[PDB]
PDB file of C-alpha atoms in Angstrom:
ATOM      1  CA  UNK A   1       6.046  23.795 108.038  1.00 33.16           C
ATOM      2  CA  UNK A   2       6.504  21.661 105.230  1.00 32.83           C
ATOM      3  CA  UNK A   3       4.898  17.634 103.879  1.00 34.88           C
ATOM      4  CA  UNK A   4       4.547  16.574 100.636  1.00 34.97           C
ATOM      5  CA  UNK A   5       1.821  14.406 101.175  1.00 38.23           C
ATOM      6  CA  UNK A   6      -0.182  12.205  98.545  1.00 40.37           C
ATOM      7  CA  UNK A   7      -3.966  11.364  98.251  1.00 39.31           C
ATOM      8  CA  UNK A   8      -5.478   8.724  96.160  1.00 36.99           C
ATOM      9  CA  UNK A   9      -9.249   9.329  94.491  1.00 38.69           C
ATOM     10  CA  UNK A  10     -10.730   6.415  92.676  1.00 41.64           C
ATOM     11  CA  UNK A  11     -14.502   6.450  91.359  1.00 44.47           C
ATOM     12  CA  UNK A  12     -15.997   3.217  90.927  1.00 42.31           C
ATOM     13  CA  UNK A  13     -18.266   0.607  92.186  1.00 44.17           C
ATOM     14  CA  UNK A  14     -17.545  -1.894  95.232  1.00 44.54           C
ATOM     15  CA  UNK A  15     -14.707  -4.169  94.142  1.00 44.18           C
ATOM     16  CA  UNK A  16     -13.590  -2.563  90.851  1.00 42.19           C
ATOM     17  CA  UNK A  17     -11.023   0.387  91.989  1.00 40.69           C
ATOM     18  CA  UNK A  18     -11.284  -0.673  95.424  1.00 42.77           C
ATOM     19  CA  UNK A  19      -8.245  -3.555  95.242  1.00 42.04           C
ATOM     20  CA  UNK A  20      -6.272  -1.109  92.838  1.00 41.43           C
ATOM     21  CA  UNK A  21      -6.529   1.614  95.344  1.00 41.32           C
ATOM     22  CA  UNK A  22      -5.641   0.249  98.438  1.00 40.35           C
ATOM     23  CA  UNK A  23      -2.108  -1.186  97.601  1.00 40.61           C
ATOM     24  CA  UNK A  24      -1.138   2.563  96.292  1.00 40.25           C
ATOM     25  CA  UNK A  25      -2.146   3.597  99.852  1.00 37.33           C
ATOM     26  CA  UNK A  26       0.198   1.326 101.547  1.00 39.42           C
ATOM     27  CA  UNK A  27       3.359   1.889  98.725  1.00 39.70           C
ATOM     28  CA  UNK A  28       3.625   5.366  99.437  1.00 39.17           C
ATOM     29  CA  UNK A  29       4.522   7.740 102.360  1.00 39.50           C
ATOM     30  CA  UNK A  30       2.010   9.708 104.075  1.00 39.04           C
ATOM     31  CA  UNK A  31      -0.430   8.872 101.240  1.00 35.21           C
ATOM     32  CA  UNK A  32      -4.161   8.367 101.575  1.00 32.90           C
ATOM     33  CA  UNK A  33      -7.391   6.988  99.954  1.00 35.40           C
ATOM     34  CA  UNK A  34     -10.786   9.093  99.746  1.00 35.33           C
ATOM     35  CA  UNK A  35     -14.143   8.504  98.122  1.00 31.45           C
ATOM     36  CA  UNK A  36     -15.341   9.683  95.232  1.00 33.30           C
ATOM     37  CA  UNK A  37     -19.130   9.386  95.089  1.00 33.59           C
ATOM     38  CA  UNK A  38     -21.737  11.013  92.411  1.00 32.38           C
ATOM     39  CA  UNK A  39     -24.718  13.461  92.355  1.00 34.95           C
ATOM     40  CA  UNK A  40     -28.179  11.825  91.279  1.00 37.24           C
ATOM     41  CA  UNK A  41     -30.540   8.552  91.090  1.00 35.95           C
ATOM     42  CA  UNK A  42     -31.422   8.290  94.761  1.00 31.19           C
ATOM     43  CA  UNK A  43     -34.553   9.076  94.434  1.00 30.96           C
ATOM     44  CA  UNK A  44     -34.884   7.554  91.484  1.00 32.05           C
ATOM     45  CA  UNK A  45     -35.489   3.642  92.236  1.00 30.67           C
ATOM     46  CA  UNK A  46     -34.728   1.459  94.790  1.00 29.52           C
ATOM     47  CA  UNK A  47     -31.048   3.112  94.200  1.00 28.82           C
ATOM     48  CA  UNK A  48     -28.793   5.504  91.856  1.00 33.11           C
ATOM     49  CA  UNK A  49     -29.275   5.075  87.934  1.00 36.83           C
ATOM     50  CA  UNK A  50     -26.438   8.038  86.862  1.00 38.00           C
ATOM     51  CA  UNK A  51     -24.192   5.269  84.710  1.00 38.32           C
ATOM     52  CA  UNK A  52     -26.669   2.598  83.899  1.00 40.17           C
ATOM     53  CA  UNK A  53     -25.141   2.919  80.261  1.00 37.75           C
ATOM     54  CA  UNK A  54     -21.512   3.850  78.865  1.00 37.81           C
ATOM     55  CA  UNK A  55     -21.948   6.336  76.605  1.00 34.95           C
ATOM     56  CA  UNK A  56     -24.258   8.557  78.671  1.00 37.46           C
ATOM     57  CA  UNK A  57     -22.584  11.953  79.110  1.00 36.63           C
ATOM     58  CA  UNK A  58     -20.757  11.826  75.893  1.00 34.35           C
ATOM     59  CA  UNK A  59     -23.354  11.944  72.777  1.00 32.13           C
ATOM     60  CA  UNK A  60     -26.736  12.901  72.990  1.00 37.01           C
ATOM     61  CA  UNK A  61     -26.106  13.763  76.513  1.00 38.56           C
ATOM     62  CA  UNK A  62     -23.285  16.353  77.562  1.00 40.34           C
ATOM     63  CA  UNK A  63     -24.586  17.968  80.961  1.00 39.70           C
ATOM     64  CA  UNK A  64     -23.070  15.202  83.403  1.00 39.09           C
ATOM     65  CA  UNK A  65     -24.154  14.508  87.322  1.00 40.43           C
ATOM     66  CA  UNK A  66     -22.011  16.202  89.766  1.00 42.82           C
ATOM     67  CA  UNK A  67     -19.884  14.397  92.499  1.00 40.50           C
ATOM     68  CA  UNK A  68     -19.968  13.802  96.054  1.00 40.69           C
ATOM     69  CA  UNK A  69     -16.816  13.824  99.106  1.00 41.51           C
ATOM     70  CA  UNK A  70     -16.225  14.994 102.242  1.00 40.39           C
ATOM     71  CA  UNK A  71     -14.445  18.826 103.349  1.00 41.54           C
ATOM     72  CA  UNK A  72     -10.981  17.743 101.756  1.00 42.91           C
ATOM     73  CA  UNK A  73      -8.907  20.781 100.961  1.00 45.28           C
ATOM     74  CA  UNK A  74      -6.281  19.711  98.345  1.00 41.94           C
ATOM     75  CA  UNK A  75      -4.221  22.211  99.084  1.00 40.64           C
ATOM     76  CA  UNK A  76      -2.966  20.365 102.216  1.00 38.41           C
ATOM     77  CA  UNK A  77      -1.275  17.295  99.636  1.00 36.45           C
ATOM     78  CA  UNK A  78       1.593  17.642  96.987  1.00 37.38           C
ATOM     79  CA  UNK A  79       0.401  14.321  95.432  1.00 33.05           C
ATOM     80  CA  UNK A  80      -3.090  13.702  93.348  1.00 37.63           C
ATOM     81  CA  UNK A  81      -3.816  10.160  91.899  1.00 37.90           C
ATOM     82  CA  UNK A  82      -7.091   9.839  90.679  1.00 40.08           C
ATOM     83  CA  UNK A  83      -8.640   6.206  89.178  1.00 38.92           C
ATOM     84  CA  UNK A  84     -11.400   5.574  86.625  1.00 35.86           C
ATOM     85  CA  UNK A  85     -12.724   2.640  83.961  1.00 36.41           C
ATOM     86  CA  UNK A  86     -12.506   3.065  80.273  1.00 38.70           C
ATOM     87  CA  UNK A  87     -14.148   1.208  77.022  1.00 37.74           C
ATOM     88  CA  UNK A  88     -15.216   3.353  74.745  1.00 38.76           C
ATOM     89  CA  UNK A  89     -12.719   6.341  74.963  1.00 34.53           C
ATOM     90  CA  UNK A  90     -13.809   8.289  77.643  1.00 36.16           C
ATOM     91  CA  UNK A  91     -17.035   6.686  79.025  1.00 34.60           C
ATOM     92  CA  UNK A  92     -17.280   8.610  82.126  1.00 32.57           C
ATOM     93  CA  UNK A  93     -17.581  12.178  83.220  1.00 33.16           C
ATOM     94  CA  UNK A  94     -16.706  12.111  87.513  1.00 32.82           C
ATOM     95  CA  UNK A  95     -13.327  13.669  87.353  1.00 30.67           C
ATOM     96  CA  UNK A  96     -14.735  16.519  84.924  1.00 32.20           C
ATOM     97  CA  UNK A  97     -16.232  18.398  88.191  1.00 30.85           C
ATOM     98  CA  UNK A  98     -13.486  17.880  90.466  1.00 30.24           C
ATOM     99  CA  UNK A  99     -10.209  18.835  88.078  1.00 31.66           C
ATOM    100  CA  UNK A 100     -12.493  22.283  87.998  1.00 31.33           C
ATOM    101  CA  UNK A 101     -12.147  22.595  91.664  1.00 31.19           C
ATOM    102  CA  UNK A 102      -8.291  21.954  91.699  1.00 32.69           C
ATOM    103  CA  UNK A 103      -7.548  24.909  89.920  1.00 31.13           C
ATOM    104  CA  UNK A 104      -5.276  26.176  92.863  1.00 32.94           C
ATOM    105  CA  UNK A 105      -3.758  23.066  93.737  1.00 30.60           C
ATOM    106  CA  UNK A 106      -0.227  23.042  94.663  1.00 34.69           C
ATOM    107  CA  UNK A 107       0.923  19.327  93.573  1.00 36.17           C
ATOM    108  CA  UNK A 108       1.109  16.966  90.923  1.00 35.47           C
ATOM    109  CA  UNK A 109      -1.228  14.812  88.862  1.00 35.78           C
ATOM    110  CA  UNK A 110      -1.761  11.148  87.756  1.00 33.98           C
ATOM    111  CA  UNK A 111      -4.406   9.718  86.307  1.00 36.32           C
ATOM    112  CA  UNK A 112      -4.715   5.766  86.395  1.00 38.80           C
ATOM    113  CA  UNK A 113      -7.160   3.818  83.842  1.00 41.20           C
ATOM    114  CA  UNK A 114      -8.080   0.208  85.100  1.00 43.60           C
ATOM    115  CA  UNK A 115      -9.175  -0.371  81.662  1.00 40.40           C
ATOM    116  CA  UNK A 116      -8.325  -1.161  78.396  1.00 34.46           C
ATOM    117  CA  UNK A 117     -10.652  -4.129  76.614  1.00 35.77           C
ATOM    118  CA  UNK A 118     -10.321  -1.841  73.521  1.00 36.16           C
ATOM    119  CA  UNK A 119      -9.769   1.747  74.255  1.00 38.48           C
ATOM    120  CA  UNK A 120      -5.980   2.066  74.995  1.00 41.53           C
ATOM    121  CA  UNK A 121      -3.909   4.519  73.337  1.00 40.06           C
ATOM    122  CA  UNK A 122      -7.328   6.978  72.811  1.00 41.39           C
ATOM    123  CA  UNK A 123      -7.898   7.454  76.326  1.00 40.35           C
ATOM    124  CA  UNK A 124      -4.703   9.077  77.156  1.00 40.81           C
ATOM    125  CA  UNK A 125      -4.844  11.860  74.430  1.00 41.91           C
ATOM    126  CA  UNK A 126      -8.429  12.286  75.229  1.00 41.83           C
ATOM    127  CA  UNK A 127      -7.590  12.919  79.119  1.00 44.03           C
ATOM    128  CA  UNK A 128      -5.166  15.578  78.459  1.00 45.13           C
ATOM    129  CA  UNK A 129      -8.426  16.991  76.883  1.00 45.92           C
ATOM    130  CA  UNK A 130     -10.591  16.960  79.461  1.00 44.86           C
ATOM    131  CA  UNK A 131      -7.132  18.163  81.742  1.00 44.02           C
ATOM    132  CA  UNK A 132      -5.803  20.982  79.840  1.00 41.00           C
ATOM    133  CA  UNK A 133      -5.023  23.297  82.582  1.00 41.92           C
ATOM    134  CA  UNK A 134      -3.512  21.249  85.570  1.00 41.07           C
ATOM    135  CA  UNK A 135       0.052  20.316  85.649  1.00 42.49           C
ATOM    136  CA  UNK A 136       0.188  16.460  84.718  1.00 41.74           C
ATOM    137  CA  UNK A 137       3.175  14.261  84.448  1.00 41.53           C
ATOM    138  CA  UNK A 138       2.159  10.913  83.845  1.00 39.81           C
ATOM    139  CA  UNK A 139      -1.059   8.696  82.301  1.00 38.58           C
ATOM    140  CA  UNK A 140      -0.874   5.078  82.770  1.00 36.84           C
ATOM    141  CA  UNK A 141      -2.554   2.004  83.772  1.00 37.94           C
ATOM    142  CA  UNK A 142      -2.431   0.256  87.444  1.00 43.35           C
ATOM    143  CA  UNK A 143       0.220   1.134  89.764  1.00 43.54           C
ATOM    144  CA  UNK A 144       3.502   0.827  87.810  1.00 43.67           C
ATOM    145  CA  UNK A 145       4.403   4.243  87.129  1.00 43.28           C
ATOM    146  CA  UNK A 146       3.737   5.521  91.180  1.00 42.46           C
ATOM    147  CA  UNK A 147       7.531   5.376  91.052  1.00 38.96           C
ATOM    148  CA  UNK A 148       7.748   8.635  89.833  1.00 38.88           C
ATOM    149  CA  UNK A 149       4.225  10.106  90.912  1.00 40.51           C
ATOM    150  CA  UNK A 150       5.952  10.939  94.352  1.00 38.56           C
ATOM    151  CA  UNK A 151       9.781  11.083  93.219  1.00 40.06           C
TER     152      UNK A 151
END
């Protein structure tokens, strides 16, 4: 048989991706919006700890928490969005794990920042970094390049 079909991952806390995700879901055909949880904290507190600062994983720290999902096999999509913050260049590490798990994905990728206080133009070079090995076509922020993520 044959669907391109499209899947939307965004990482963030209740509110933050959450409105930038859901219109993206409802734009596109056959499209779809999954969690992306992390690794860590738990027991640790009354609850998680594993980004209680920006520039954790980045300086001083470099091993980074893994992430969390359900049996999603992205092999079964042609289409892979993926969401995230930004202010100091790259203060985050979630998508690190799972672009190493997509290594034979059939598709395309798109990364959208919901960002950019003062870390614009860095943030796309230092992507492609962090990338370098999946077939991207497009970095921009909020949903007005999705025109030709799926086109």
């Amino acid at each position: 048989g044959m669907a391109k079909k499209t899947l939307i991952l965004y990482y963030s806390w209740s509110g933050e991706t959450k409105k930038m995700a859901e219109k993206i879901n409802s734009e596109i055909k056959d499209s779809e919006l999954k969690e992306v949880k992390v690794s860590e904290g738990t027991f640790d507190a009354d609850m998680y700890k594993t980004s209680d600062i920006a520039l954790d994983q980045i300086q001083g720290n470099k091993d980074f928490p893994e992430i969390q999902l359900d049996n999603i096999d992205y092999n079964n999509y042609d289409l892979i969005l993926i969401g995230s913050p930004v202010w100091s260049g790259y203060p985050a590490t979630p998508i690190k794990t799972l672009l190493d798990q997509m290594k034979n994905y059939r598709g395309e990728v798109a990364s959208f920042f919901t960002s950019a206080g003062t870390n614009h133009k860095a943030y796309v070079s230092h992507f492609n970094e962090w990338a370098d090995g999946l077939n991207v076509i497009g970095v921009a922020r909020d949903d007005s390049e999705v025109d030709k993520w799926s086109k």
